[PDB]
Design an enzyme around this catalytic site. Structure first.
Site, PDB file in Angstrom:
ATOM      1  N   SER A   1      -0.078 -10.583  -0.770  1.00  0.00           N
ATOM      2  CA  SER A   1      -0.566 -10.222   0.559  1.00  0.00           C
ATOM      3  C   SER A   1      -0.419 -11.388   1.535  1.00  0.00           C
ATOM      4  O   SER A   1      -1.242 -11.591   2.426  1.00  0.00           O
ATOM      5  CB  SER A   1      -2.009  -9.720   0.502  1.00  0.00           C
ATOM      6  OG  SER A   1      -2.160  -8.596   1.354  1.00  0.00           O
TER       7      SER A   1
ATOM      8  N   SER B   1      -7.118  -5.229   3.490  1.00  0.00           N
ATOM      9  CA  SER B   1      -8.478  -5.445   3.948  1.00  0.00           C
ATOM     10  C   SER B   1      -8.430  -6.012   5.356  1.00  0.00           C
ATOM     11  O   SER B   1      -7.424  -6.577   5.791  1.00  0.00           O
ATOM     12  CB  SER B   1      -9.262  -6.371   3.012  1.00  0.00           C
ATOM     13  OG  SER B   1      -8.674  -7.657   2.967  1.00  0.00           O
TER      14      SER B   1
ATOM     15  N   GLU C   1       0.848 -10.062  12.020  1.00  0.00           N
ATOM     16  CA  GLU C   1      -0.299 -10.710  11.396  1.00  0.00           C
ATOM     17  C   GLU C   1      -0.763 -11.891  12.248  1.00  0.00           C
ATOM     18  O   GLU C   1       0.064 -12.629  12.791  1.00  0.00           O
ATOM     19  CB  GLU C   1       0.050 -11.204   9.993  1.00  0.00           C
ATOM     20  CG  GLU C   1       0.412 -10.106   9.008  1.00  0.00           C
ATOM     21  CD  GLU C   1      -0.782  -9.288   8.546  1.00  0.00           C
ATOM     22  OE1 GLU C   1      -1.925  -9.572   8.965  1.00  0.00           O
ATOM     23  OE2 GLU C   1      -0.571  -8.350   7.748  1.00  0.00           O
TER      24      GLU C   1
ATOM     25  N   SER D   1      -3.174  -4.691   5.289  1.00  0.00           N
ATOM     26  CA  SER D   1      -2.027  -5.161   4.521  1.00  0.00           C
ATOM     27  C   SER D   1      -1.283  -4.061   3.778  1.00  0.00           C
ATOM     28  O   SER D   1      -0.204  -4.340   3.251  1.00  0.00           O
ATOM     29  CB  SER D   1      -2.451  -6.240   3.521  1.00  0.00           C
ATOM     30  OG  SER D   1      -2.610  -7.477   4.195  1.00  0.00           O
TER      31      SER D   1
ATOM     32  N   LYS E   1       2.387  -3.738   4.615  1.00  0.00           N
ATOM     33  CA  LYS E   1       3.437  -4.613   4.099  1.00  0.00           C
ATOM     34  C   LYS E   1       4.433  -3.864   3.226  1.00  0.00           C
ATOM     35  O   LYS E   1       5.585  -4.297   3.111  1.00  0.00           O
ATOM     36  CB  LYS E   1       2.812  -5.785   3.334  1.00  0.00           C
ATOM     37  CG  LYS E   1       2.059  -6.743   4.258  1.00  0.00           C
ATOM     38  CD  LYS E   1       1.201  -7.771   3.525  1.00  0.00           C
ATOM     39  CE  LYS E   1       0.485  -8.632   4.568  1.00  0.00           C
ATOM     40  NZ  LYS E   1      -0.699  -9.347   4.040  1.00  0.00           N
TER      41      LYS E   1
END
Length: 260
Positions: A103, A210, A139, A43, A46
């Site tokens: 996230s 993570s 994702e 993440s 992002k």
């Protein structure tokens, strides 16, 4: 150096692979540990997607207010904010905030779509001089963190230099840079990571990450009280596909760095 001895000992105690890049903007000195090895971004990627949309808004002035539909088919594995708006809309600003501060993975996928695919996020990295960052997937598959897989990776050195340009440099326009900084400072997921190893008076803006293989990441811009800001990138990944997150390792890396 002394810091690299301690980081190496921390890494050895952890059983994983640790990557650290510090940039001290006071003298533009760098502290690197495995600074040129690739790590899965998870993440932390992002930040690049949000920054790419911010860059588009320098020309499309109303872009951040554009409403984007959230449909049930858009939801992936972790959508804390997007789930609150299913069958409604969120603006690109709200999606960027959700991606950065919570996230939210649906928010990330909407940002990727706005940019025309992962290739559009990678393009922005190239346009600001990051030749290392690569985003290959959406994702949630970008988090597979398979050892040796170059997809969706960057290096600590590259991410630290890019995070510096986005937040303290001028890769973005002034209103956009301030918005990015405000978003990072309001992150809600970072309390146990870099922030936990730094003095409580220091102000941190960070983005955690993570994924599989116990991958545990944090990238941060740090404003010490009465001192030039710092940029700190901490990446960590492990040999077992089912390894638990180790945010304590990032906290300990930050503490070792802050000792210097």
């Amino acid at each position: 150096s002394a810091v690299q001895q301690k980081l190496a000992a921390l890494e050895k105690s952890s059983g994983g692979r640790l990557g650290v890049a510090l940039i001290d903007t006071a003298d533009n000195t760098q502290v690197l540990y495995r600074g040129d090895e690739r790590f899965p971004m998870c993440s932390t990627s992002k930040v690049m997607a949000a920054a790419a949309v911010l860059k588009q808004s320098e020309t499309q002035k109303q872009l951040l207010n554009q409403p984007v539909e959230i449909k049930p088919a858009d939801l992936v594995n972790y959508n804390p904010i997007a789930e609150k708006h299913v069958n409604g809309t969120m603006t690109l600003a709200e999606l960027s905030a959700a991606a950065l501060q919570y996230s939210d993975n649906t928010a990330m996928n909407k940002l990727i779509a706005q940019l025309g695919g992962p290739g559009g996020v990678t393009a922005f990295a190239r346009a600001i001089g990051d030749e290392t960052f690569r985003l290959d997937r959406t994702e949630p598959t970008l988090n597979t963190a398979i050892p040796g897989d170059p997809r969706d990776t960057t290096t600590p050195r590259a991410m630290a230099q890019t995070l510096r340009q986005l937040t303290l440099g001028h890769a973005l326009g002034e209103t956009q840079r301030a918005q990015l900084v405000t978003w990072l400072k309001g992150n809600t997921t970072g309390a146990a990571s870099i922030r936990a190893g730094l003095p409580t008076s220091w102000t941190v803006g960070d983005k955690t990450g993570s994924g599989d293989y116990g991958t545990t990441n944090d990238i941060a811009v740090i404003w010490p009280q009465g001192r030039a800001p710092l940029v700190l990138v901490t990446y960590f990944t492990q040999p077992q596909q089912n390894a638990e997150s180790r945010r304590d390792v990032l906290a300990s890396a930050a503490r070792i760095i802050a000792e210097g």
